[PDB]
Amino acid sequence: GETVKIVRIEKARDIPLGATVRNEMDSVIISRIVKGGAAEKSGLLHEGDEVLEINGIEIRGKDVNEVFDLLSDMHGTLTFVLIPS
Ligand SMILES: [Cl-]
């Protein structure tokens, strides 16, 4: 029951993404969606989503702090490639 989805989210310049992530082996999984952030506002990211790509950058195989680092420099439109829980 897995289907790859492409979702595009707008992240205003004074609004954090507000999503937390965890590693399950090489997989990167969304843990919490925080109220007030761009993720929550968009309604397009879900707890349990496995993140494959963000703006073309491969995400599988990366650790939690690497991912947060990458996100911190991404503004404007963010295109996620993911597998829903
Ligand atoms: Cl803006």
Numbering used by the authors: 251 to 335
Task: Quote from the publication.
Apical localization of the Crumbs (Crb) transmembrane protein requires a PDZ-mediated interaction with Pals1 (protein-associated with Lin7, Stardust, MPP5), a member of the p55 family of membrane-associated guanylate kinases (MAGUKs). Pals1 belongs to the MPP family of proteins (membrane protein, palmitoylated), also known as the p55 subfamily of membrane-associated guanylate kinases (MAGUKs).
This crystal form has a single copy of Pals1PDZ in the asymmetric unit. The structure of ligand-free Pals1PDZ reveals a sterically blocked peptide-binding groove, as confirmed by fluorescence polarization in vitro. The Leu321 side chain adopts a favoured rotamer in the absence of a partner peptide. We therefore considered whether Phe318 could act as a potential gating mechanism restricting access of ligand to the PDZ peptide groove. We note that the ligand-free Pals1 PDZ domain closely resembles that of Par6, which is known to bind both internal and C-terminal peptide ligands. Examination of the open carboxylate-binding loop of ligand-free Pals1 PDZ domain with Par6 bound to an internal peptide ligand suggests that Pals1 could also bind internal ligands.
